[PDB]
Symmetry: C3
């Protein structure tokens, strides 16, 4: 945990200005930081405020340095340096340590080295957990699923059967990976279940938020690429494919057989329909209503934002009657054209 | 479980064309299928492609049969036949087998024949589980709740107290049935909890997806009809009634005391207001904003879909100022007339 | 079971009829039978009170002439209903006593009359106040503190360093304290920002099922006293919610949003972050909140449902509204 400021600077590739023997115990916001804390400045408007910050050290740029009133770590990119130093000084505990006597683990499960399984977690037959995997308390990992080295599940995560998860993933509590996709045939109004015998394949370095659901495929697989980040409360339907490094913010709903490219950014509460493709490098702003394929990179948006309710009532009434407005406009144009 | 093609054809009521002794081990998509697999063709444009499919048998229609390049099962409805053969050849495991020594089962719980309960599940007093019920690992089933024969819960499902679930239901993980409805009275700005002492009644053959919540009623009950299918991440508020055979796709949010008729279809991410009714045979397309009662069957839609952001900025600004556009149109009409 | 006269006294209601009637429970007007008390708020029900079979009806003074049973007269029947339903509550507790299958770290501190349900897992450093009840299968992470009288239903997840006040209630499937969605970006690769802030939940907070409230990045996510939050809500890192605000089901809130006191956020609304909503704001259902709200009142958005045939035309015309605007401008110029 605690680290000499000089050592922290070397690991951050930062230029130290000040006492390298200062001991840093943790990261804090500029407002909250006290002795022993390191903090960071990304906004030069706070230069005049640094004498009010009581951090032992502040990460800043070269242009900021003349304004320091503390030991300073000078870097090109304070925000990225903050992320790195917060990892070095991370106080987040592990989901579990060692193997809980109350865990229920099938004799055929294969564990790598340094695996931890929390209290009352349930591990099915054929499961493989790679080196350094951590399964939180209360999880379920279904038959024959494989979790790659370094991956970690927080408490009360559910992995169904035949799921593959790569290395260095992180899954937050309440998430369900591998439930049945929403597949039914129809025999005269009677829904006939289509067994969902595809899988979910999750790549390396994937982070998934809490209470997110990712359904298994109907025959072929649901696929989440490497480096993807998914927020809370998302729904990823059967046979969705998400390309490497795409980010999906909270509450996004994706319908079946959607394909999303690489380096996409899907804003919170968006709705993305299925059986279509979104190309690489597309940004959908929050609450976007995606009805058609997207074939060019760029930023796309939908939605009519808030108005005072009395105003909204009129806006909505006029929009709902916009066909009459169109007809009146055309009628007027004809009269002005002398026809 | 492997099966002879002629035996499979018989169970499917299909006309066999080819070798009945072929052993089928599984179902596969047309592109993935290998020897031992059965697959199906629903799209006649793939007739010319059948010689590229390595399945041991293909389900198809009588019109497709001249194009077969394999043993064929001829049926009227290949898609329905696929559903049925996938059931016959299902590889999905059961949520549990036998009764786990780590399950915690109240002495007063009543278990039927051939009930399986997974590791660390918790069964309260007065619970009744019918024959062949399977409770996944980590589940909670609350006091006096009843689960009908053949119904199955995947892992980590929560059923509260006094819940009734019918026969042959299936509930996916993370789902919560019977939490308090959102009932509060207001006392000078402070919320006063209204205990929710109604229940949830779930019919037979209901399928519920993952991380869905169905709240119990305030006084009378939340009711899910028979044959209803509900996708993931849905919110079904207190005292909602959903008619038989209705389908609710993922992410739908329903407010309290909504009544939906039979054979409705509610598209994903729709939002439905409360204290009102939707009649039978209504379809709401995805993201529908349902504010008012629906009294006639048919298809209903809302929402302005995506545009390039530069375009959207103008669309949104113009719509928000549409009253001014309307006034100008009226003024121009008066001036011209 | 309670004598009507006693129930009326506890509700500060004026009794009209036989005080010795024994009330066993609350029921809706349509379902009520002998032994039940019910209530009416809508005067449409006056004509058919002869058909209500309750033993007593909570009503107003103006309703009293239509009464066909013992009546409790009050100013506010709905609020009185809430109070009498609490007196007559049949809801069981999430747990009774400490289950032998619960796994409780030796360093956890438990107050008086704490109950812990089967297979719950209590981490090191946890503090549970007097009369706290933890449901079956819950997880409560390291050093979290839950204040007296608070209750978790089954399968609730509380992460580490979380603080929950007194008399709270959290429904099943809810997750409090997961990582906020915080990442830096290094040449297209996401770089996790550890989320080492917390969640602070006040007193008398109720949280619905499968709701998620993320911990803050450095400073905290804060839920005020008396806040009620429905199912399937997302409260992002460093959101702050003022006292007595209500959040209906399926609301998604983005990071660093500040919501004032006495707000009402309608179901399925979407509230963007790094902005503030003042006190006494109502956002009706499905509201798309993109800008700060600085004046109290009611706000709304969205183009509602139409028959599909009509919607197709509405949507096409709105998407082309810039062309309509240009055509109107051109016509004004010509005229
Ligand atoms: C991943 C990141 C580090 C960067 C990022 O772009 C991002 C983040 N949080 C975000 N929350 N909501 C959000 C909006 C409304 C409600 C709830 C959440 C976004 O829409 C986010 C977005 C974002 C914004 C627009 C388009 C696409 C994205 Cl993904 C954090
Ligand atoms: C049940 C079925 C076999 C048939 C079906 O109609 C269906 C299905 N999946 C569906 N996903 N989304 C969906 C759309 C957007 C986001 C998430 C999911 C529908 O809206 C579906 C619908 C559907 C479409 C329109 C109206 C009502 C419904 Cl129920 C699969
Ligand atoms: C808290 C309360 C006792 C009172 C209340 O105002 C309320 C309640 N439940 C509500 N469900 N949905 C809801 C709407 C659509 C889908 C799902 C749920 C509201 O939008 C509610 C609202 C409400 C209505 C208008 C504006 C803001 C709010 Cl909060 C119950
Ligand atoms: Mg146990
Ligand atoms: Mg939603």
């Amino acid at each position: 945990g605690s680290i000499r400021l000089a050592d922290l600077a070397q690991q951050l590739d930062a230029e130290l200005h000040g006492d390298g023997d200062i001991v840093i115990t943790g990261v804090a916001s500029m407002q909250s930081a006290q002795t022993g804390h390191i903090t960071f400045m990304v906004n030069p408007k706070y230069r005049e405020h640094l004498g009010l910050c009581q951090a032992s050290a502040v990460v800043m740029t070269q242009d900021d340095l003349p304004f320091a009133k503390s030991a300073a770590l000078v870097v090109k990119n304070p925000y990225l340096t903050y992320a790195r130093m917060a990892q070095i000084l991370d106080t987040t505990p592990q989901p579990a340590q060692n193997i809980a006597p109350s865990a229920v683990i099938d004799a055929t499960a294969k564990l790598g080295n340094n695996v931890s399984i929390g209290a009352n977690a349930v591990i099915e037959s054929g499961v493989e957990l790679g080196d350094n995997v951590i399964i939180g308390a209360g999880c379920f990992v279904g038959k024959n699923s494989k979790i790659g080295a370094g991956s970690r599940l927080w408490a009360n995560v559910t992995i169904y059967h035949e799921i593959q998860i790569g290395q260095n993933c992180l899954i937050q509590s309440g998430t369900v990976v591998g439930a049945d996709g929403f597949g039914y045939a129809n025999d005269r109004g009677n829904w006939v279940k289509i067994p969902q015998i595809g899988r979910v394949i999750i790549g390396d370095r994937v982070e998934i938020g809490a209470c997110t659901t990712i359904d298994r495929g109907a025959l072929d697989d649901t696929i989440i690429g490497n480096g993807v980040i998914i927020d809370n409360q998302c729904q990823i339907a059967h046979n969705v494919v998400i390309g490497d490094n795409t980010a999906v913010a909270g509450g996004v709903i994706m319908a079946g057989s959607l394909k999303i490219g690489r380096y996409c950014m899907i804003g919170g509460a968006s709705v993305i329909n299925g059986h279509m493709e979104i190309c690489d490098k597309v940004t959908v702003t929050g609450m976007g209503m995606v009805m058609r394929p997207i074939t060019e990179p760029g930023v796309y948006s939908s939605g009519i934002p808030l108005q005072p309710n009395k105003v909204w009532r009129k806006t909505a009434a006029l929009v709902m009657n916009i066909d009459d407005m169109s007809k009146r406009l055309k009628s007027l144009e004809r009269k002005v054209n002398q026809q």
